Design an enzyme around this catalytic site. Structure first.
Site, PDB file in Angstrom:
ATOM      1  N   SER A  71      -1.128   1.421  -1.087  1.00  0.00           N
ATOM      2  CA  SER A  71      -0.296   2.691  -0.908  1.00  0.00           C
ATOM      3  C   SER A  71      -0.333   3.241   0.410  1.00  0.00           C
ATOM      4  O   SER A  71       0.585   4.135   0.683  1.00  0.00           O
ATOM      5  CB  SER A  71      -0.264   3.623  -2.254  1.00  0.00           C
ATOM      6  OG  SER A  71      -0.259   3.019  -3.534  1.00  0.00           O
ATOM      7  N   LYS A  74       2.955   3.700   2.349  1.00  0.00           N
ATOM      8  CA  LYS A  74       3.848   4.726   2.276  1.00  0.00           C
ATOM      9  C   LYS A  74       3.939   5.727   3.254  1.00  0.00           C
ATOM     10  O   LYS A  74       5.108   6.095   3.742  1.00  0.00           O
ATOM     11  CB  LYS A  74       3.265   5.425   0.887  1.00  0.00           C
ATOM     12  CG  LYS A  74       3.688   4.872  -0.596  1.00  0.00           C
ATOM     13  CD  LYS A  74       3.262   5.960  -1.824  1.00  0.00           C
ATOM     14  CE  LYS A  74       3.608   5.287  -2.984  1.00  0.00           C
ATOM     15  NZ  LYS A  74       2.625   4.034  -3.123  1.00  0.00           N
ATOM     16  N   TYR A 184       4.236  10.793  -8.970  1.00  0.00           N
ATOM     17  CA  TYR A 184       3.926   9.444  -8.218  1.00  0.00           C
ATOM     18  C   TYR A 184       4.896   8.373  -8.695  1.00  0.00           C
ATOM     19  O   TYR A 184       4.749   7.845  -9.932  1.00  0.00           O
ATOM     20  CB  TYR A 184       2.554   9.065  -8.139  1.00  0.00           C
ATOM     21  CG  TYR A 184       2.189   8.301  -7.079  1.00  0.00           C
ATOM     22  CD1 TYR A 184       2.316   8.459  -5.624  1.00  0.00           C
ATOM     23  CD2 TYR A 184       0.986   7.313  -7.256  1.00  0.00           C
ATOM     24  CE1 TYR A 184       2.016   7.571  -4.643  1.00  0.00           C
ATOM     25  CE2 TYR A 184       0.608   6.599  -6.210  1.00  0.00           C
ATOM     26  CZ  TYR A 184       1.089   6.552  -4.949  1.00  0.00           C
ATOM     27  OH  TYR A 184       0.741   5.944  -4.104  1.00  0.00           O
TER      28      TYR A 184
END
EC number: 3.1.1.-
Length: 413
Positions: A71, A74, A184
């Site tokens: 992640s 991101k 999320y």
């Protein structure tokens, strides 16, 4: 599953000692840490431990090993999206229905019958790029909203095992009305698709010209890593992860990467720690290498409106709060900026006010502290099975010991 915000990792643990103990315990193989101030005055880069090749041969860990960001992608996708806003191809509040009709077509799942069939509600408003980047679109990872998990199982995936694109994979309803909440989810996978569409090229092409080229970064690739030159340095291409999925980074429970095709802006990037910190630093310095300084400035604002923010802060107190808090104190005022969690108050001798921070899987974590002029990334290279609670402590050790080393260095000039 527990808050590791304050304790011996917070107040005592030293990276040198703690990582080395974790290695000899056999619970990690090594680590890569990279931190810097805006000018490259204070700089700490340490690769510790060993990696194993697919052949079984062992090598010392090294600063240019190619790592799985999970992640942490991101943040990089967020930048590419903001780079399209600079060019005027997008805007943070525009309706994306034209570009990504799949998100306009999504209803808001409200609950279930006793027939076990979905009740929905149409979206009170269009979904915007800004809601994508702040996890306030309503799109959630199914493992964080049981409703979406139930719905996803009922509308069973026919097991036509064919790699799917972003739109072919995150097909579920929203979990709340656009803008009115926080959870999320694949908001940045959607964002990366939008980038591909408005630009008419692949995500990797765009990132390569607009992020990696300006910074001198050449050793990057999305999953799957097909470049033989990168594969020779891939930490996660080893006898425990013979497919290079990033198993050790995401831990147990499965893999983001397994059954997709195309770039996944939520979790798909591979990168060395050295190159990742260049990105962190270009934003710390606000040196106009990736964005104009006002645009970078806009990343370090609370972007959740009142309705979303309460939902965020309620989620941070939910049983999944530990995950969402990134090591911050349950009493620290936080919001959500464009790129990660945003500290809203100051913490003395730790994160300044308006520090942006997020992570990857269970083993990687990054921060940008503009007020105290420090940024950094710490990536544990775990061994399966990945011990989640211990990884939180190891990450905490990095998050504080790097400030300790900063203070010591500053008391030496």
């Amino acid at each position: 599953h527990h808050h590791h915000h304050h304790g011996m990792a917070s107040e005592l643990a030293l990276m040198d000692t703690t990582f080395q103990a974790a290695i000899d315990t056999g619970k990690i193989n090594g680590a890569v840490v990279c931190a810097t101030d805006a000018q490259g005055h204070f700089v700490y880069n340490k690769a510790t431990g060993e990696r194993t090749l697919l052949s079984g041969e062992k090598q010392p860990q090294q600063l240019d090993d190619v790592l799985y960001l999970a992640s942490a992608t991101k943040l990089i996708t967020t930048i590419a999206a903001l780079q399209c806003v600079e060019d005027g191809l997008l805007s943070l509040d525009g309706d994306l229905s034209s570009i990504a009709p799949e998100l306009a077509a999504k209803y808001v799942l409200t609950g279930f019958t006793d027939d076990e069939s979905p009740l929905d509600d149409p979206p009170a408003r269009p979904i915007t790029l800004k809601m994508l980047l702040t996890h306030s679109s309503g799109t959630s990872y199914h493992f964080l909203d049981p409703s979406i998990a139930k719905w996803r199982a009922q509308y069973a995936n026919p097991e036509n095992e064919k790699p799917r694109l972003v739109e072919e994979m995150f097909t579920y309803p929203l979990s709340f009305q656009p803008g009115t909440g926080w959870m999320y989810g694949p908001g940045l996978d959607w964002a990366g698709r939008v980038v591909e569409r408005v630009t008419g090229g692949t995500l990797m092409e765009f990132m390569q010209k607009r992020i990696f080229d300006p910074l001198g970064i050449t050793d990057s690739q999305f999953y799957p890593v097909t470049r033989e030159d990168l594969r020779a340095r891939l930490v996660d291409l080893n006898p425990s992860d013979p497919g290079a999925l990033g198993s050790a980074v995401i831990g147990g429970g499965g893999e983001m990467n397994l059954r997709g095709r195309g770039a996944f802006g939520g979790h798909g990037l591979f990168l060395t720690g050295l190159d990742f910190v260049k990105i962190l630093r270009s934003l710390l310095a606000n040196d106009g290498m990736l964005l104009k300084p006002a645009a970078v400035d806009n990343m370090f604002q609370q972007h959740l409106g009142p309705e979303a923010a309460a939902s965020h802060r309620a989620a941070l107190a939910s049983p999944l709060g530990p995950f969402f808090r990134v090591g911050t104190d349950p009493e620290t005022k936080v919001g959500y900026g464009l790129g990660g969690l945003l500290t809203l108050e100051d913490v003395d001798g730790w994160y300044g006010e308006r520090t942006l921070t997020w992570g990857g899987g269970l083993t990687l974590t990054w921060f940008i502290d503009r007020k105290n002029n420090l940024c950094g990334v710490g990536a544990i290279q775990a061994v399966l099975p990945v011990d989640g609670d211990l990884m939180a402590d190891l990450k905490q050790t990095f998050r504080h010991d790097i400030y300790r080393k900063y203070s010591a260095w500053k008391g030496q000039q």
